[PDB]
Design a protein around this ligand. Structure first.
Ligand SMILES: *[C@@H]1O[C@H](CO)[C@@H](O[C@@H]2O[C@H](CO)[C@@H](O)[C@H](O)[C@H]2NC(C)=O)[C@H](O)[C@H]1NC(C)=O
Ligand SMILES: *[C@@H]1O[C@H](CO)[C@@H](O[C@@H]2O[C@H](CO)[C@@H](O)[C@H](O)[C@H]2NC(C)=O)[C@H](O)[C@H]1NC(C)=O
Ligand code: NAG
Lengths: 50, 50
């Protein structure tokens, strides 16, 4: 199928109306970031020639 | 099949038709002695950085 970006949400804009929140949600989200790799060392002489 | 290594006793039970043993990387890490049908582990010699 042709992908859909998101559901349409037409915001009810007018020159004299505002939307004020009456409540809140404390949301905890995860962010995973790589820091280091496996430290590898290669003996060039042994690898090429044994 | 030639190489250099430390030959120790092995707990791996080979099938009777199999002679050599390979790891994921297709390197011989287990072998069967031809004279006496016993399995030997081939541990690489302790090469290291100084
Ligand atoms: C604030 O008022 C506007 C206008 O009355 C609301 O917008 C409409 O909301 C209804 C309810 O689903 C929709 O069917 C209409 O299509 C909306 N109009 C537009 C132009 O988007 C809006 O929902 C109200 N806000 C709140 C929080 O109730
Ligand atoms: C704001 O939202 C919180 C939840 O996000 C509401 O707390 C809930 O209140 C109802 C009825 O008192 C309980 O049955 C729920 O268990 C409560 N939820 C939690 C997480 O405690 C709170 O009442 C909302 N406030 C307003 C003014 O709407
Ligand atoms: C090889 O010969 C030796 C004795 O020379 C014997 O002990 C051993 O069992 C033999 N192995 C095989 C696989 O025939």
């Amino acid at each position: 199928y042709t992908m859909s970006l998101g559901a349409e949400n037409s915001v009810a804009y007018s020159n004299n109306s505002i939307a004020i929140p009456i409540n809140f949600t404390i949301s905890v989200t995860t962010e995973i970031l790589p820091v280091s790799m496996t430290k590898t060392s290669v003996d060039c002489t042994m690898y090429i020639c044994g | 099949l030639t190489g250099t290594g430390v030959l120790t006793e092995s707990n791996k039970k080979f099938l009777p038709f199999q002679q050599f043993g390979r790891d994921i990387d297709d390197t011989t890490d287990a072998v069967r002695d031809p004279q006496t049908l016993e399995i030997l582990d081939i541990t690489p010699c302790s090469f290291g950085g100084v």
